[PDB]
């Protein structure tokens, strides 16, 4: 009956509303993915409940157990019916879950504290004074783990061994680490999240360089789900009608503070 949606607290995709405690269920949350879920549900004709992924992760497979965690795991093991989140379409994930055509484009990018002497990934790789890392259990880390491209592989070799550790549990922890590190920490994260934060007080970070790759976020469903077909057509509809662009302006730039 009611579709269980798994999602993740990530600004400006899903955020606890300012006055949520006096609100109940889905009304406690706002954001790009909250509006998207409402649109998708409207067009596919289902009722839904938003749930925050229990382990707070996007999804990766444990090398030893082979068990998936995060939102991907919640789909794989039957704990949720659909994931509506900034979840990156990847080869490894497509092997175990289904994705709609992308609803948003992104690439890996570099976040620095304003004034930091870094302009590119190549820059980061040719030095050591400034440490840099990525999010745990996500596609950015996996991208670096598996890249045969010379510059990226060298970055991965430094990251996988550094001490203290350069990886963070949440995007917020990575951003805070940049802001409090006096320019000695740079954070590798998706351009969407980088560009959003850049327009938020205290206005002390910025995106530098071009994107390191090009990929997309998709709405994910359990493999063979009956929901997959309708959801895909809905994403295409919403893109063609300009809604996806409308939502993007609503949450990134109509909400800039800088």
Ligand X SMILES: N[C@@H](CCC(=O)O)C(=O)O
Annotated binding-site residue? 86:
yes
Terminal CA-CA length for the chain: 44
State which of residues 50, 108, 131, 244 lies at the interface with a copy of itself (CB under 8 A).
244
87 binding partner (options ligand X, Zn ion, a copy of itself, none; Cβ < 5 to 8 Å by kind) = ligand X
State which of residues 4, 16, 92, 206 lies at the interface with Zn ion (CB under 5 A).
16
Q: How many CB atoms lie within 10 A of CB 238?
A: 20
Annotated binding-site residue? 139:
yes
Chain residue at closest Cβ approach to Zn ion: 16
Annotated binding-site residue? 105:
no
Query: In this structure, what token pair is assigned to residue 106?
Result: 């992104």
| Distance from the Cα of residue 189 to its chain's centroid | 8
16 binding partner (options Zn ion, ligand X, a copy of itself, none; Cβ < 5 to 8 Å by kind) = Zn ion
162 binds a copy of itself (CB under 8 A): no
Annotated binding-site residue? 102:
no
Provide the strand spans (E) within the chain. 3-7, 15-16, 29-30, 48-52, 82-83, 97-99, 104-106, 108-113, 131-133, 185-190, 205-208, 215-217, 220-222
Q: How far is the C-alpha of 60 from the C-alpha of 149, rounded, in Å? A: 22
Q: How many CB atoms lie within 10 A of CB 67?
A: 11
38 binds Zn ion (CB under 5 A): no
- Residues numbered 210 to 229 that lie near a copy of itself (CB under 8 A) are 213-216, 218
88 binds ligand X (CB under 6 A): yes
Binding residues for L-glutamate: 86, 88, 93, 139-140, 190
């Amino acid at each position: 009956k009611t579709v269980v949606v798994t999602t993740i607290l990530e600004s400006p995709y899903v955020m606890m509303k300012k006055n949520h405690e006096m609100l109940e269920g889905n009304e406690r949350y706002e954001g790009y993915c909250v509006d998207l879920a409402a649109e998708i549900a409207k067009h596919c004709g289902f009722k839904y409940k938003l749930t925050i992924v229990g382990d707070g992760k996007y999804g990766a497979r444990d090398a030893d157990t082979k068990i998936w965690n995060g939102m991907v795991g919640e789909l794989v093991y039957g704990k949720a019916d659909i994931a509506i989140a900034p979840l990156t379409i990847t080869l490894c994930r497509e092997e175990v879950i289904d994705f709609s055509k992308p609803f948003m484009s992104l690439g890996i990018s570099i976040m620095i504290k304003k004034g930091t002497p870094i302009e590119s990934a190549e820059d980061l790789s040719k030095q050591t004074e400034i440490a840099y890392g990525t999010l745990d259990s996500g596609s950015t880390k996996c991208f670096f783990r598996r890249s045969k491209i010379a510059v990226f592989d060298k970055m991965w070799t430094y990251m996988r061994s550094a001490e203290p550790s350069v990886f963070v549990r949440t995007t917020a922890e990575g951003v805070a680490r940049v802001r409090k590190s006096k320019g000695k920490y740079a954070y590798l994260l998706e351009s969407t999240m980088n560009e959003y934060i850049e327009q938020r007080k205290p206005c002390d970070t910025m995106k530098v360089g071009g994107n390191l790759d090009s990929k997309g976020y998709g709405i994910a469903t359990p493999k063979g789900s009956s929901l997959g077909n309708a959801v895909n057509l809905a994403v295409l509809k919403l893109n063609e009608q300009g809604l996806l662009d409308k939502l993007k302006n609503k949450w990134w730039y109509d909400k800039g503070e800088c």
